[PDB]
Structure formats: structure tokens, C-alpha cells
Design a protein around this nucleic acid. Structure first.
Length: 437
RNA sequence: GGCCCGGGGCGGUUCGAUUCCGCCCUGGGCCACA
């Protein structure tokens, strides 16, 4: 029931069992033999190469080394031919540069081409940096592979493990650097409780200082922040999580939380209880990768939230959910309906010129003086948040993300009420409103 | 694709805009993917 106790039991959820290990070992062996039969210059990297991969995420990473002089095009072509002949099944994948994904004796494999170099300088792409990251780590993490797994298991269980945009959490690399710095999971967790948004962890110098942003300097390049994509809020969630764990250690921190569904009926009652306006913007999900899509959902979500605040609808929070089918931007506002009239500030009574221009506008109500300046009663084009957004989304589709915006232009509808509780967003809404139980 | 800094033209709104909402060109930095 104490820290050490829970951690022993926790290993059982993060460390791969022998069957997963053997399975990987057997594929690595066969993979070596196949690569050697073509006399290919390669180097295994990543969590598999260093036995730090989390249970259930066995994936082998093989980077193909290429002379500095080779053209970026030769790399991909020869890179493609090589993965082709060595994999049981292949599938060209992409990123900064293309590569090949596939299978071998049951396990996932990534065949990636990079430049064989020396000295981080002369680098050309993130992929070239990966081997250096690998070298720096193989000597220093040996022996603490399970501390890495506990850290990864902890983060994953709490939805902040990957560094991709859908997550904005802590990359695997980041986790290993943290273990090398603190020595173990518990030490990392114990100290993270004192982390601030100004913390700078410099691995190479074995130092922690106060900078301008959360910054974990890459031992391989002092200018690179390894936690660059860790969001401010995800950082906050981690620090808070560490405080709670240290105060009441539980194995629950390493178990994925149950989706805990809710009957749409109860959701309705809660929204009625809140007296708020709850609605969603629904449109078709553009066929793009999560890495281009989520940042677009975040922007679109924010531009609308911003429209809602300047338009005085008192938005509480925004959210969004993507599906195979559509995307949903979710909102909740304190104001279901606002009056048509509102007041417009005018010039000070002294400014005869501007006062005169200000009184030339034909208005339905007649302006007045108050505290030394003129004011005008004006009429709104819309009186509900839904109306406002239908208006905003129809004309400002372009500012809502390149793709999301293009899809919104060709189609979008606003759903509210019972018709909304039937969409696949009941979970995002419960989180947005802090529904508990 | 998104985010940060900077430039050159515009449209709309406002008594008044560099300064609100947005649109075209456009230079630099960065991030995710591998």
C-alpha cells in the first residue's frame, strides 16, 4: 500500500512478458539475417533497441545509413527497394521524408533512410538526428529500462504519453532523458512536483534552471527543446498528477481510465441543470492525417470561442471530437439569448466633429450622453450563440484551418439539444462540463 | 498543416484603426510525423 509496493505491481503492467519479448527477439534475428544477406549498412534504434518499449507496443526501428553525399532522392528509392525485399508486407508511409513500414514474423517494423554522419552538425532532417539520440542513450539508460517503462505506463494511462498533436504530451525520448537525469521513475515524479512553466532541465549539464519556457535541452543539440510540443496544460496535469501520486500511491494511476459512458438522458438533465447553451458545429472530417487535422480542430475551435466572447455570449469552454465520418466543435455558453439592442460607445461631448459624424447615422433609437460622452443604442444581427456561429462559420470558414475550413465551407450544421446527445460526443461533453461520478 | 517574429498591398466594421474582423502576395524561426 506504499509507493515501493505499488511500483512492484506496476511493473507487471508495463514490462513486456516473455512471449512478447521472444516474439520481438525472433523478428530482430530474422530481420538481421535478411539485411545481412544484402549486405546492408543498418542500425537498430528506438525503444526496442534499448529494451525500453512499453508492453503491448512492440515495434522495431531500423535506420538505414547512407553516405553523406547521396541525394535525398537516392535515399528514398534505395530506401524503398531495401524495405521492399526485407519485409513480409510493406506500406510506404510519410513524414518529413517518405519511408517504409511493414511486418516480419508477426512484429511491426519501420525501415527508415538517413545519412550516416558524425557530429550533430551537418545534419539535414530530424531522422539524421535519431542515430545520435540513440548513441547518447544506449550507454546511459542501460539498467533503468524498467524505470522508463513505469514512466511511460504512468503517462499513457493518464492520456499524455505521445508527443504528436492529438496528445501534446511527453515523447518516448523525453522519458528516457528524464530517467537518465533523475535516475528512476520515483525520483522523476518526486521532483516534477516542483516543476514550473519556467523550468529548464539541461541533461548534458546535469542542471535545472529557470528559463522562459519549459525546456528540456537535447543532449545532442543544446538549441533543441525535447519537450517543445508538451502543452502548458499537459505539463500542469503531470505536475499535479505527481503530487497526488506521492500523497496517495495507487495502482490505479497505471490503469487506463474506463470510458464511463452516460445515458443521454442524464446528460440532458445536467445541461438543463446548468441552464447553459450547449451545441456543436458538425462537418465532414477532411481526409488528412491526425497531425494536420487536430491542430486545425484546435484553431477552428478557438476562432469560434473568440467570436463567442467578443459577441458577449460568455463561452465557458470549447472542445472537439473527430470520427471516421465527421468532426465536432463543441461549445457551452452562459448566454442562451441576448437582447437585440446593445450600446455603442461614441466620442466625448467636446469633439464637435466626431460627435456630428456619430449623430449622422440614421438609427432607430436616438443616442444619449452619459459621463461626458455620447452613446448609441444599436441592433444585433443575431441573438443566440447558435445564430452567431451559423453566421460566423458561413463567412469566416477560411480562417478555421486550411482543410477544416474548406470542409466547413462546403458543409456544416449546428446541432443542439436531444438531437446533439445522439451524436458520438457524450464523452467529450462530460469532460467539458466536468461531469463527475 | 499548425504555432512565433517580420515585412508589401487590400476588403469590412467604427466618430475615429497600424491598433477590431478578415483577405491576397511575402521573408525568417519552430513544431508533429519518420
Amino acid at each position: 500500500m506504499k509507493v515501493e509496493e505499488i511500483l512492484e505491481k506496476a511493473l507487471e503492467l508495463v514490462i513486456p512478458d516473455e512471449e512478447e519479448v521472444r516474439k520481438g527477439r525472433e523478428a530482430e534475428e530474422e530481420l538481421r539475417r535478411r539485411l545481412d544477406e544484402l549486405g546492408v549498412e543498418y542500425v537498430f534504434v528506438g525503444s526496442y533497441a534499448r529494451n525500453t518499449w512499453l508492453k503491448g507496443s512492440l515495434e522495431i526501428d531500423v535506420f538505414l545509413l547512407f553516405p553523406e553525399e547521396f541525394s535525398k532522392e537516392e535515399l528514398r528509392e534505395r530506401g524503398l527497394e531495401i524495405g521492399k525485399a526485407v519485409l513480409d508486407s510493406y506500406e510506404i508511409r510519410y513524414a518529413e521524408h517518405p519511408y517504409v513500414h511493414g511486418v516480419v514474423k508477426g512484429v511491426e517494423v519501420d525501415v527508415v533512410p538517413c545519412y550516416k554522419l558524425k557530429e550533430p552538425k551537418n545534419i539535414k532532417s530530424a531522422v539524421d538526428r535519431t542515430p545520435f539520440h540513440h548513441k547518447w542513450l544506449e550507454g546511459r539508460i542501460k539498467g533503468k529500462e524498467n524505470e522508463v517503462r513505469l514512466l511511460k505506463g504512468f503517462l499513457k494511462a493518464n492520456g499524455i504519453y505521445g508527443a504528436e498533436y492529438k496528445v501534446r504530451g511527453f515523447s518516448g525520448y523525453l522519458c528516457e532523458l528524464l530517467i537518465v537525469f533523475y535516475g528512476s521513475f520515483l525520483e522523476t515524479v518526486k521532483n516534477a512536483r516542483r516543476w514550473t512553466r519556467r523550468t529548464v532541465i539541461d541533461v548534458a549539464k546535469g542542471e535545472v534552471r529557470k528559463g522562459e519556457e519549459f525546456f528540456v535541452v537535447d543532449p545532442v543539440d543544446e538549441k533543441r527543446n525535447v519537450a517543445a510540443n508538451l502543452s502548458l496544460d499537459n505539463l500542469a496535469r503531470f505536475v499535479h498528477l505527481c503530487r497526488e501520486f506521492m500523497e496517495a500511491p495507487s495502482l490505479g494511476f497505471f490503469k487506463p481510465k474506463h470510458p464511463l459512458e452516460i445515458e443521454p438522458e442524464r446528460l440532458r438533465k445536467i445541461v438543463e441543470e446548468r441552464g447553459t447553451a450547449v451545441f456543436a458545429v458538425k462537418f465532414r472530417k477532411p481526409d488528412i492525417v491526425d497531425d494536420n487535422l487536430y491542430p486545425q480542430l484546435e484553431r477552428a475551435s478557438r476562432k469560434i470561442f473568440e467570436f463567442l466572447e467578443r459577441e458577449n455570449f460568455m463561452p465557458l469552454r470549447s472542445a472537439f471530437k473527430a470520427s471516421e465520418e465527421f468532426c465536432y466543435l463543441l461549445f457551452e455558453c452562459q448566454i442562451k439569448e441576448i437582447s437585440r439592442v446593445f450600446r455603442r460607445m461614441g466620442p466625448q461631448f467636446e469633439d464637435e466633429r466626431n460627435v456630428k459624424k456619430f449623430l449622422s447615422r440614421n438609427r432607430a433609437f436616438r443616442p444619449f450622453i452619459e459621463n461626458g460622452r455620447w452613446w448609441a443604442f444599436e441592433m444585433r444581427k443575431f441573438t443566440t450563440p447558435e445564430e452567431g456561429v451559423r453566421s460566423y462559420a458561413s463567412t469566416h470558414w477560411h480562417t478555421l484551418g486550411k482543410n477544416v475550413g474548406e470542409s466547413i465551407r462546403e458543409y456544416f450544421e449546428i446541432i443542439s439539444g436531444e438531437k446533439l446527445f445522439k451524436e458520438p460526443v457524450t464523452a467529450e461533453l462530460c469532460e467539458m462540463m466536468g461531469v463527475k461520478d
